[PDB]
Design an enzyme around this catalytic site. Structure first.
Site, PDB file in Angstrom:
ATOM      1  N   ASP A 213       0.845  -1.201   0.000  1.00  0.00           N
ATOM      2  CA  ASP A 213       0.000   0.000   0.000  1.00  0.00           C
ATOM      3  C   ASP A 213       0.873   1.241   0.000  1.00  0.00           C
ATOM      4  OD1 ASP A 213       0.725  -0.510   2.701  1.00  0.00           O
ATOM      5  OD2 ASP A 213      -1.191   0.060   3.556  1.00  0.00           O
TER       6      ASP A 213
ATOM      7  N   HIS B 145       4.414  -0.280  13.301  1.00  0.00           N
ATOM      8  CA  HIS B 145       3.668  -1.064  12.333  1.00  0.00           C
ATOM      9  C   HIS B 145       4.610  -2.021  11.605  1.00  0.00           C
ATOM     10  CE1 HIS B 145       1.011  -2.153   9.045  1.00  0.00           C
ATOM     11  NE2 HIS B 145       1.882  -1.661   8.159  1.00  0.00           N
TER      12      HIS B 145
ATOM     13  N   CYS C 114       1.072   3.987   7.982  1.00  0.00           N
ATOM     14  CA  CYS C 114       0.412   2.909   8.714  1.00  0.00           C
ATOM     15  C   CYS C 114       0.866   2.830  10.168  1.00  0.00           C
ATOM     16  CB  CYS C 114       0.686   1.601   7.965  1.00  0.00           C
ATOM     17  SG  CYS C 114       0.304   1.740   6.194  1.00  0.00           S
TER      18      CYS C 114
ATOM     19  N   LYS D  49      -2.500   4.931  14.078  1.00  0.00           N
ATOM     20  CA  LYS D  49      -3.553   3.928  14.245  1.00  0.00           C
ATOM     21  C   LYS D  49      -4.420   4.250  15.456  1.00  0.00           C
ATOM     22  CE  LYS D  49      -2.830   1.145  10.786  1.00  0.00           C
ATOM     23  NZ  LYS D  49      -1.821   0.043  10.883  1.00  0.00           N
TER      24      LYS D  49
ATOM     25  N   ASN E  59      -2.804  -4.359  10.825  1.00  0.00           N
ATOM     26  CA  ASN E  59      -2.142  -5.640  10.531  1.00  0.00           C
ATOM     27  C   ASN E  59      -0.839  -5.830  11.289  1.00  0.00           C
ATOM     28  OD1 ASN E  59      -0.733  -7.745   9.224  1.00  0.00           O
ATOM     29  ND2 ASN E  59      -0.169  -6.360   7.519  1.00  0.00           N
TER      30      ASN E  59
ATOM     31  N   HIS F 134      -4.968   4.706   6.932  1.00  0.00           N
ATOM     32  CA  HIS F 134      -6.242   3.991   6.828  1.00  0.00           C
ATOM     33  C   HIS F 134      -7.354   4.632   7.645  1.00  0.00           C
ATOM     34  CE1 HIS F 134      -3.942   1.089   4.617  1.00  0.00           C
ATOM     35  NE2 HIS F 134      -3.131   0.863   5.637  1.00  0.00           N
TER      36      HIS F 134
HETATM   37  O1  LIG Z   1      -0.149  -3.641   6.720  1.00  0.00           O
HETATM   38  C1  LIG Z   1      -0.770  -2.791   6.045  1.00  0.00           C
HETATM   39  O2  LIG Z   1      -0.122  -1.816   5.608  1.00  0.00           O
HETATM   40  C2  LIG Z   1      -2.253  -2.881   5.746  1.00  0.00           C
HETATM   41  C3  LIG Z   1      -2.612  -4.232   5.096  1.00  0.00           C
HETATM   42  C4  LIG Z   1      -1.718  -4.494   3.892  1.00  0.00           C
HETATM   43  C5  LIG Z   1      -0.657  -5.392   3.978  1.00  0.00           C
HETATM   44  C6  LIG Z   1       0.194  -5.628   2.888  1.00  0.00           C
HETATM   45  C7  LIG Z   1      -0.054  -4.984   1.662  1.00  0.00           C
HETATM   46  C8  LIG Z   1      -1.099  -4.073   1.574  1.00  0.00           C
HETATM   47  C9  LIG Z   1      -1.955  -3.859   2.667  1.00  0.00           C
HETATM   48  C10 LIG Z   1      -3.112  -2.707   7.008  1.00  0.00           C
HETATM   49  C11 LIG Z   1      -4.525  -2.223   6.590  1.00  0.00           C
HETATM   50  C12 LIG Z   1      -5.396  -2.349   7.823  1.00  0.00           C
HETATM   51  C13 LIG Z   1      -5.922  -3.607   8.092  1.00  0.00           C
HETATM   52  C14 LIG Z   1      -6.724  -3.834   9.233  1.00  0.00           C
HETATM   53  C15 LIG Z   1      -7.002  -2.727  10.030  1.00  0.00           C
HETATM   54  C16 LIG Z   1      -6.489  -1.471   9.743  1.00  0.00           C
HETATM   55  C17 LIG Z   1      -5.654  -1.232   8.654  1.00  0.00           C
HETATM   56  O3  LIG Z   1      -6.840  -0.629  10.720  1.00  0.00           O
HETATM   57  C18 LIG Z   1      -7.677  -1.336  11.649  1.00  0.00           C
HETATM   58  O4  LIG Z   1      -7.752  -2.682  11.139  1.00  0.00           O
HETATM   59  C19 LIG Z   1      -2.470  -1.761   7.984  1.00  0.00           C
HETATM   60  O5  LIG Z   1      -1.843  -0.741   7.614  1.00  0.00           O
HETATM   61  O6  LIG Z   1      -2.529  -2.005   9.216  1.00  0.00           O
HETATM   62 ZN   LIG Z   2       1.791  -1.874   6.185  1.00  0.00          ZN
HETATM   63 ZN   LIG Z   3      -1.129   0.070   5.582  1.00  0.00          ZN
END
Ligand SMILES: O=C(O)[C@@H](Cc1ccccc1)[C@H](Cc1ccc2c(c1)OCO2)C(=O)O
Ligand SMILES: [Zn+2]
Ligand SMILES: [Zn+2]
Ligand SMILES: [Zn+2]
Length: 220
Positions: free
Chosen positions: A79, A137, A156, A159, A165, A195
Site C-alpha cells: 500500500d 507497524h 500505517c 492507528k 495488521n 487507513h
Molecule cells: O499492513 C498494512 O499496511 C495494511 C494491510 C496491507 C498489507 C500488505 C499490503 C497491503 C496492505 C493494514 C490495513 C489495515 C488492516 C486492518 C485494520 C487497519 C488497517 O486498521 C484497523 O484494522 C495496515 O496498515 O494495518
Molecule cells: Zn503496512
Molecule cells: Zn497500511
C-alpha cells in the site's frame, strides 16, 4: 469492481490521494497518500496500491502540467510501494530507506532506485523531511513532515482506533516509538493516517494509547 482513485486538496499544494484494494480478510481497505507540489515539481508521498492507480494519479498531474520529480515510500508493504515498478518504467525517480529496500528485495519485489538512511532525510530542503521514529507497524516505517504547512504524513504507523495488521509489527517497540513521534510532532496542525481520515495531533496520542493497550493485551 473496486472504488476509484480519489484526488482531493488538503491545503495549498498538498493533495490527498485515496486508493482502494481488497486486503486479505479485511474487505476493501482505503489507503491515503499525498501528492506534494513544490511549485511545478510534484512529489508522491507513498504510491497507490496499484500500477494502474499510480498511472492515473501521475497522468492527472502530468496532464495539468506538473513534473513528477519523485516518490517516497513510507514502508515496504504494497500500500506504500505498489506503484514503484510503474514509476521506474517511466524514469520517475523512486526513494525508500535502505531497510525498506532490503525488505522489498527479500519479498521478491522491485526496489526503489534511490535509497537513504539516517534518522532524518530531506527529500527537499525545508520542504519534505523523512523521519524514522523507531519500529512500529513495521521495522522500517517512517513518517513525512511538511514544515511549511505543518502537515505530518503518518503512514500505517498512525492507528488511533486499533493497530491493524500486526503481521510485521513490533508491538514491544511501538509505544516508545509512538511517544517519540508524539513529542517531536506534537504541534502538527494535521495528521494524515494511511487507513483513517485526517485528524489533528490527537491521533498521535490515540496511537500511543492503542500501542500501550495492544502491548498489555498480547502479554495478557
Ligand atoms: O499492513 C498494512 O499496511 C495494511 C494491510 C496491507 C498489507 C500488505 C499490503 C497491503 C496492505 C493494514 C490495513 C489495515 C488492516 C486492518 C485494520 C487497519 C488497517 O486498521 C484497523 O484494522 C495496515 O496498515 O494495518
Ligand atoms: Zn503496512
Ligand atoms: Zn497500511
Ligand atoms: Zn479518505
Amino acid at each position: 469492481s473496486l472504488p476509484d482513485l480519489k484526488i482531493e486538496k488538503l491545503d495549498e499544494g498538498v493533495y490527498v490521494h485515496t486508493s482502494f484494494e481488497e486486503v486479505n480478510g479485511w474487505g476493501v481497505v482505503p489507503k491515503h497518500g499525498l501528492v506534494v507540489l513544490v511549485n511545478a515539481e510534484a512529489y508522491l508521498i507513498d504510491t497507490p496500491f496499484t500500477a494502474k492507480d499510480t498511472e492515473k494519479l501521475v497522468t492527472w498531474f502530468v496532464e495539468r502540467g506538473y513534473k513528477i520529480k519523485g516518490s517516497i515510500s513510507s514502508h515496504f508493504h504494497s500500500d506504500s510501494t505498489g506503484g514503484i515498478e510503474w514509476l521506474n518504467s517511466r524514469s520517475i525517480p523512486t526513494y525508500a530507506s535502505e531497510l525498506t529496500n532490503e525488505l522489498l528485495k527479500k519479498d521478491g519485489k522491485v526496489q526503489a532506485t534511490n535509497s537513504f538512511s539516517g534518522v532524518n532525510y530531506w527529500l527537499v530542503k525545508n520542504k519534505i523531511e523523512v523521519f524514522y521514529p523507531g519500529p512500529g507497524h513495521t521495522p522500517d516505517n517512517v513518517v513525512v513532515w511538511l514544515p511549511e504547512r505543518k502537515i505530518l504524513f503518518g503512514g500505517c504507523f498512525i492507528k488511533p482506533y486499533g493497530l491493524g495488521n500486526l503481521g510485521d509489527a513490533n508491538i514491544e517497540a511501538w509505544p516508545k516509538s509512538a511517544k517519540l513521534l508524539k513529542s517531536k510532532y506534537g504541534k502538527a496542525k494535521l495528521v494524515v493516517p494511511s487507513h483513517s481520515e485526517v485528524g489533528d495531533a490527537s491521533l498521535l496520542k490515540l496511537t500511543l494509547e492503542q500501542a500501550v493497550k495492544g502491548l498489555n493485551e498480547s502479554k495478557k
